[PDB]
Amino acid sequence: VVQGTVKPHASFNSREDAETLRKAMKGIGTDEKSITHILATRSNAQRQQIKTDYTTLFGKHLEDELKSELSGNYEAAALALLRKPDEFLAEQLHAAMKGLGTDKNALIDILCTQSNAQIHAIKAAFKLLYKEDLEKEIISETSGNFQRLLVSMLQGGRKEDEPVNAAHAAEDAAAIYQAGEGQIGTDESRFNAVLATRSYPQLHQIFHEYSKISNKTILQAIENEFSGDIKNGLLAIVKSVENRFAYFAERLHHAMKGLGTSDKTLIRILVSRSEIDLANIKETFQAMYGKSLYEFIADDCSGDYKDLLLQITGH
Amino acid sequence: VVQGTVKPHASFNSREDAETLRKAMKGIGTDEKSITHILATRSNAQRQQIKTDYTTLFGKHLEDELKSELSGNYEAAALALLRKPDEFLAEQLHAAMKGLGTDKNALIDILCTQSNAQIHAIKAAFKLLYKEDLEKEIISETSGNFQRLLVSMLQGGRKEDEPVNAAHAAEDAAAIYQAGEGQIGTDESRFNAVLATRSYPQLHQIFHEYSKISNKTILQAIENEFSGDIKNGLLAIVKSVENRFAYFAERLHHAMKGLGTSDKTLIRILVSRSEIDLANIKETFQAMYGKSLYEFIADDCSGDYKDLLLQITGH
Amino acid sequence: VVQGTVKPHASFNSREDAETLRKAMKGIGTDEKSITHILATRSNAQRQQIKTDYTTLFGKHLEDELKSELSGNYEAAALALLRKPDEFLAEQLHAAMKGLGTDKNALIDILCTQSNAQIHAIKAAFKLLYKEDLEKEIISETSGNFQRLLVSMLQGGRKEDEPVNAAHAAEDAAAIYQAGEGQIGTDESRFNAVLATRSYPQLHQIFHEYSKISNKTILQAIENEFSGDIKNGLLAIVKSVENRFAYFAERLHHAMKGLGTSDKTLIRILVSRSEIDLANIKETFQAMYGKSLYEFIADDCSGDYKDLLLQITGH
Amino acid sequence: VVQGTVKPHASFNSREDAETLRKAMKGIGTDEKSITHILATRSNAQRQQIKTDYTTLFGKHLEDELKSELSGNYEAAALALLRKPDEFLAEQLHAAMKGLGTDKNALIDILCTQSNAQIHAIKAAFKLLYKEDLEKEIISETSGNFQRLLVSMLQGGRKEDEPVNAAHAAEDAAAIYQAGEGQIGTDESRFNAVLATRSYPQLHQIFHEYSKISNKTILQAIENEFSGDIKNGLLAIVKSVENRFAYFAERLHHAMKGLGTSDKTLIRILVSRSEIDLANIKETFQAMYGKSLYEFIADDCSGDYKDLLLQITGH
Amino acid sequence: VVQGTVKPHASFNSREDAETLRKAMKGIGTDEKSITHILATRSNAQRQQIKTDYTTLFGKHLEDELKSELSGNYEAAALALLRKPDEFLAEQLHAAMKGLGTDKNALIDILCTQSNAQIHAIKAAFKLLYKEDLEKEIISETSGNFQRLLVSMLQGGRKEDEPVNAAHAAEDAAAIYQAGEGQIGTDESRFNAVLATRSYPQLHQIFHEYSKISNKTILQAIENEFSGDIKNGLLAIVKSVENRFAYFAERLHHAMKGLGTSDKTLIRILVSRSEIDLANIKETFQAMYGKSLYEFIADDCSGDYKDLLLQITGH
Amino acid sequence: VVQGTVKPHASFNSREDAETLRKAMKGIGTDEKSITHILATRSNAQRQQIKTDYTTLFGKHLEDELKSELSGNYEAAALALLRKPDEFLAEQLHAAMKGLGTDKNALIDILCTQSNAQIHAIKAAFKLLYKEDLEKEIISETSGNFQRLLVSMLQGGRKEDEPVNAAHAAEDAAAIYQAGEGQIGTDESRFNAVLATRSYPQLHQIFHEYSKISNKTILQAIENEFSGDIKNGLLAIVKSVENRFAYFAERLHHAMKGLGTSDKTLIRILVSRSEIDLANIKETFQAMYGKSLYEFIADDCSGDYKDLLLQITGH
Ligand SMILES: [Ca+2]
Ligand SMILES: [Ca+2]
Ligand SMILES: [Ca+2]
Ligand SMILES: [Ca+2]
Ligand SMILES: [Ca+2]
Ligand SMILES: [Ca+2]
Ligand SMILES: [Ca+2]
Ligand SMILES: [Ca+2]
Ligand SMILES: [Ca+2]
Ligand SMILES: [Ca+2]
Ligand SMILES: [Ca+2]
Secondary structure (H helix, E strand, O other): OOOOOOOOOOOOOHHHHHHHHHHHHOOOOOOHHHHHHHHHHOOHHHHHHHHHHHHHHHOOOHHHHHHHHOOHHHHHHHHHHHOOHHHHHHHHHHHHHHOOOOOHHHHHHHHOOOOHHHHHHHHHHHHHHHOOOHHHHHHHHOOHHHHHHHHHHHOOOOEOOOOOOHHHHHHHHHHHHHHOOOOOOOOHHHHHHHHHHEOHHHHHHHHHHHHHHOOOOHHHHHHHHOOHHHHHHHHHHHHHHHHHHHHHHHHHHHHOOOOOOOHHHHHHHHHHOOOOOHHHHHHHHHHHHOOOHHHHHHOOOOHHHHHHHHHHHOO | OOOOOOOOOOOOOHHHHHHHHHHOOOOOOOOHHHHHHHHHHOOHHHHHHHHHHHHHHHOOOHHHHHHHHOOHHHHHHHHHHHOOHHHHHHHHHHHHHHOOOOOHHHHHHHHOOOOHHHHHHHHHHHHHHHOOOHHHHHHHHOOHHHHHHHHHHHHOOOOOOOOOOHHHHHHHHHHHHHHOOOOOOOOHHHHHHHHHHOOHHHHHHHHHHHHHHOOOOHHHHHHHHOOHHHHHHHHHHHHHHHHHHHHHHHHHHHHHOOOOOOHHHHHHHHHHHOOOOHHHHHHHHHHHHOOOHHHHHHHHOOHHHHHHHHHHHOO | OOOOOOOOOOOOOHHHHHHHHHHHHOOOOOOHHHHHHHHHHOOHHHHHHHHHHHHHHHOOOHHHHHHHHOOHHHHHHHHHHHOOHHHHHHHHHHHHHHOOOOOHHHHHHHHOOOOHHHHHHHHHHHHHHHOOOHHHHHHHHOOHHHHHHHHHHHOOOOOOOOOOOHHHHHHHHHHHHHHOOOOOOOOHHHHHHHHHHOOHHHHHHHHHHHHHHOOOOHHHHHHHHOOHHHHHHHHHHHHHHHHHHHHHHHHHHHHHOOOOOOHHHHHHHHHHHOOOOHHHHHHHHHHHHOOOHHHHHHHHOOHHHHHHHHHHHOO | OOOOOOOOOOOOOHHHHHHHHHHHHOOOOOOHHHHHHHHHHOOHHHHHHHHHHHHHHHOOOHHHHHHHHOOHHHHHHHHHHHOOHHHHHHHHHHHHHHOOOOOHHHHHHHHOOOOHHHHHHHHHHHHHHHOOOHHHHHHHHOOHHHHHHHHHHOOOOOOOOOOOOHHHHHHHHHHHHHHOOOOOOOOHHHHHHHHHHOOHHHHHHHHHHHHHOOOOOHHHHHHHHOOHHHHHHHHHHHHHHHHHHHHHHHHHHHHHOOOOOOHHHHHHHHHHHOOOOHHHHHHHHHHHHOOOHHHHHHHHOOHHHHHHHHHHHOO | OOOOOOOOOOOOOHHHHHHHHHHHHOOOOOOHHHHHHHHHHOOHHHHHHHHHHHHHHHOOOHHHHHHHHOOHHHHHHHHHHHOOHHHHHHHHHHHHHHOOOOOHHHHHHHHOOOOHHHHHHHHHHHHHHHOOOHHHHHHHHOOHHHHHHHHHHHHOOOOOOOOOOHHHHHHHHHHHHHHOOOOOOOOHHHHHHHHHHOOHHHHHHHHHHHHHHOOOOHHHHHHHHOOHHHHHHHHHHHHHHHOHHHHHHHHHHHHHOOOOOOHHHHHHHHHHHOOOOHHHHHHHHHHHHOOOHHHHHHHHOOHHHHHHHHHHHOO | OOOOOOOOOOOOOHHHHHHHHHHHHOOOOOOHHHHHHHHHHOOHHHHHHHHHHHHHHHOOOHHHHHHHHOOHHHHHHHHHHHOOHHHHHHHHHHHHHHOOOOOHHHHHHHHOOOOHHHHHHHHHHHHHHHOOOHHHHHHHHOOHHHHHHHHHHHOOOOOOOOOOOHHHHHHHHHHHHHHOOOOOOOOHHHHHHHHHHOOHHHHHHHHHHHHHHOOOOHHHHHHHHOOHHHHHHHHHHHHHHHHHHHHHHHHHHHHOOOOOOOHHHHHHHHHHHOOOOHHHHHHHHHHHHOOOHHHHHHHHOOHHHHHHHHHHHOO
């Protein structure tokens, strides 16, 4: 069972909840504790009904009230939870591209880990939100091999119906070897080609065949053959195929490293995976680092922000 | 029975009808009599087929031919009957906002008296027509408590399935009392919340419970508690709930009241209700005013304009 | 001497005037008389600085305060005064085109009476206001000979430096005669050509010449040759040449004719001429109809609306 | 049976075909013979699958590869085959309008020969491609009777389910006679009216009736009465009714006659009809011209362009 | 003397600097140390010529090369230096609004601290950059009093030529006393009006006059009367009037506060001020915290990011 | 002396000229002979005043008349003559890109042969006409090294005032030798860099230096190093430096070669240069081919089309 850590409130009443939120903001001070309680303990779909009831009740959109009443990471993390999932990811790409500089790790997290269908939903929410084509925007903010990998990812053209086939897999592994390790130069497009088109089951088989023909894993071959964005983007696909839980777990760890948090990263992953597989991600992070995700968050974030993240995630 | 005064013409032939309209315009002179007769005795859906056929037969749109051949109120009323119904109100909203000044009675007649689905259809048609968000244009031409009521109306978020419940009605009646009569200042927000979200049947119940706890009616308190547009909008809601027929009946009277006519308002109600409840409105007007709606129109407008309105309205 | 009736206020202090306007709207109640006083006794240029100081002081634009606190024809005339002149006419054209149906009398008044330079400023104000091209919107709301005349007008191609020449004027007079009276059918384009490109002084000479070679005046020939919109447009140009003062006067009268004021026509001409030739127009108004413009307005309009018009126009 | 000359390839593998295309382009030289082979022997739907897989394997769109690697008519023909059929005709429309002059016969080829459904699909594609309205663009690049025929065509309003009826047909056959032959002037609008609105089977009946009340066929009648753009537009409607295959054969013949080749017309007809009726068109050509379409093309084209076109067409 | 820390490089050769940058990026590896040196030791005006030459030499824009070759805060800071100063602030604004949530402190740093001329340059750059109106976006991402103060700032309508005058200053200060301290409720608007319209010197006087009538300073008074965004915005204007250098000092300090670093904030101020008053800000910072800005950045930043920041700043 | 072949008509009267054009199109048929005469013997600036007067006179644009009244190459050339010169080129680019496929030779003719001033005016005209960025459209329809060359050309960044420097010229010729002839592979970026940024006189000196270190000329090295579009682009630059007249002569000759005519290229070069250097181009053409340009056009074209080309060119 793959599952998230956020469950719909039983005995849901959005009108009451929307009045509850009004109560916390109404007048001097903010009852953030009340805000955090409602947003964290209701599911996204319920949050969407709460948003509807607030606007109808008060003539102001809930997001705007929070933009005014909350600040910093707490603010952002509250607004993230209010986004419909697809919209949240679309806006995350928008911010990754059109802020100061390019957040290329964010683009990899989002575009190198999706199924065809997920990719297409995100493209449609992006068009909807900004009235522009997502691929057009990525090509204006990236270039070279990295750009091409992202363009491949955006077609949603993975042959997801391709069955596992050891013989062909061995053939692809040999072609990958030849394109990288087995030569002085590199045929990068062969790495792009295999990793973007083969079904996840068949890529798993390809990686197993690869380990048979070299003394390095595909992971090591790529790490050694490339650098910078294109290396990270190719690695992210391998990792998402072998263990997506670990991919996120690993990303979560790195976001929280040292005396400072990549708060965008932490918020995006916890929220976006909140109702899909954050339970397994929690399980995997434990095994991988011995420490609970929670304690990691608890000791990296402060105030209400920390309290909200803690409550979505779970112990 | 609730119903309008315009019904589909039998033995309908859209092609013939388009050739008739052409005839009435080609060569020196304009046969307004024939143009009126076609427009007033063919239903909205039939008129759309006439427009398609006219354009296909002549390579010019009917609307553009009328815009050239007709003038003043007759032109507007003819054009108003050619519009699809959701389109008509979209353009009416548009014109109430982006012309000189803000026609707020128009906004109230249109946005305070609709059902959830009704509103949604209007917003959909507005987007279709102006490639803009009705809400965004609304917020640019209004402000304060009036804007917020309009925003609430535009959500289409009334809990239309809320059952009549005397107890809950009294909780709500008291809230509104304490927010208005019961204090020196006002909580308009509570008026907004209740009037926008409760279903019509429970609201009717609420005004009743209100009269049990106050010496004023809801009508009087609202009259006494506010001023201008915000007063008018909330009142418009209470009136639509108790008797939509009355409300429309009234605006008709006001439109034709004065030694001059609010021709804009007259065309809008006559046309937009023509296939829904204008008969009932007719039945009610006569009740409130003794004079029949037709006679009032026959007395207050002239020429082709009058004749068009008369034919749509019926005796 | 040619001059308006509104004159710059002496010892002008925009910051003070904006404070007064605030005080008039702040709290329950609206002091329309102070608002009327500031608006009508300050020049348009001065109004622009008061709008500036009002937004800077209070973080809300003056027009938006007026859109909320004022209504009907008063709101409209007050807002009319706040617009810069090019903007006011560009918006008037917009409203004439984009409302329900077409206000072609509005198009002629504005488009058929201006100088090359006035049309250009209006075209530029329109684009700045709506992003769209004026000529392109006109072509979509009009057709046939009338559309072409307004397109001619939109070029600002009149030969304003063509000097009075009797010989050439007689030739123009002859082609126009042959164009209409001289034949069974018409050469409407010849009417368009001469009336659009000749200078006003030369056109005056051409009309003098026409009445010599014909038993009809150019006015009567046009009346006789054409109908509807294109007839009124060509008529308007002849009247604007002979006496612009009489043209607006007539429009004013007509606007106030019978039992109903075309209030936008009235508002439009009182506002847009207010600082140009409103003085000469009132003079001519008296001459043609025995009553002062003032008395006609005061007898035809009411309340705050009436006060404002009266105060901008003066006795 | 009516059918095209291009059929889906047996044992289709779009990943292999995409790899084949890349091989033909990568490195030194370009293997046009292999490009032609893949394009000409796979169906349009297959080519779409090949496009998706090329972009997914390599991170670059196939069209862009060809835009760089190919040149002249060969590039245009190859790109044409890659377009979805509706997009192809939409783009063909654009290029007929938005280039230097106006390719009016192209506009006739495309808008006067389609069914209602086909017209609606081309319109939607155009709006998809360009974010503009086809009608709106057509009205900006054409005028007069010619424009109106194209506007008629663009409504997709033909009464396609109109049953044959000798009596009503004769009425139209007489009306059309009077609009042209039975006088010195012409009533063009009647030719427009009947030619755009009646079902193809009923028009065919009307052409029959026409011959019974005239000396000249409707073709001859139309030739005589009209000239230029509108004459060819009306003639194209009569031809599409009487012998659609004959029309294209004629156009094809026309493209290749003289001292050159109208290659854009040649490519547009062969490609757009390749999976529709190029077979029957090929037959009719030989019937009318005694020489095969293949031979004519072999005679008139050269290089990979010729090769490509010959392969599409078939002996 | 007030001045920045970056000066034009002597014997400048943009063609050469562009080749230098090319050389640092081509092939295996990246010479970040050479990129840092060109960017930090050439002035913004020199950097613009370097961009022009890079693009002309190589057919790729410098910004795009760094978006690929660089990452994280180093990428951001390098890209920030390449932006023209007006464009930099505008895109800084865009990012404060259109990411996830609102960077309210960024809005205040940029919008409540400029001269009228500076504010108009920023808006013009934004319009050029985003093809949208700055104020429009602002009203969408902020609300209430904080929104109103920002709309005030955007007008650029401060009366900068208002002379210092004790009497008018005592008035303002007394009016300010009554709107906060003096009364139970608050008249926020009075604070908004005085702080937005008064010249900085008159504001200085007005703050003295407040000290004459209250035991609270203007800061204590505002701290006492408000909270959240509007409090911070009003405090910022006072601080900007009293000592602009100390405001940046305090904001830099706070950016590097925690364990920590608001890098977005740190980058914006050092870059935005690098050529204006950073030297004085450097002086002031030493004074306020007894440690140099330099050693502060050094201990708070790492790698090539800190290297660039240290070089821009200087010891 | 460098000059065109079209000179302003003596005793110019645009009103009369417009009347001449109307007459040649009104009624039975068209006087193509009179239209050719006005277009061919008036200058562009005079044509612009003629256009303005026709539209003012008649309320339709001259371009729109010719689009209906003229066809084929004849329509195209007249319309070309009517365009303002910067507009004409922007539209040549547009058509080269947004028709079926890409006309790469036209992009080279236009973008590889201009001064910085000339390119900036073309971009500005393109942005005007299409509300788009020319560089963005270019990158959409080109790729690889050819795209990069076009992007360089679009910066308008040539150091046109670079003094001839023999030491630098020898350096530049040695780096180009090492980037091509000198090694097995190629450093395309170095050809790009030198050919786009150096002044024409310095390039001339560089080409001379090349022949001191190589057995090939620079033309030969490029021919042997590259193929396809990039080769042609680099060659056009070299040819433009050495003798632009010849480049144009050479393209003209190519366009008139074969058993047809690239009328696109012929019209573009004759029109675009008619008032710049077509006289000098005619000489050089004579010198290179032995036959005059006039007789070549005469041999290759027909009808009014040939007539107009011939009259523009002159003997
Ligand atoms: Ca960016
Ligand atoms: Ca290798
Ligand atoms: Ca408005
Ligand atoms: Ca109260
Ligand atoms: Ca209209
Ligand atoms: Ca006549
Ligand atoms: Ca065109
Ligand atoms: Ca935001
Ligand atoms: Ca207080
Ligand atoms: Ca193209
Ligand atoms: Ca080499």
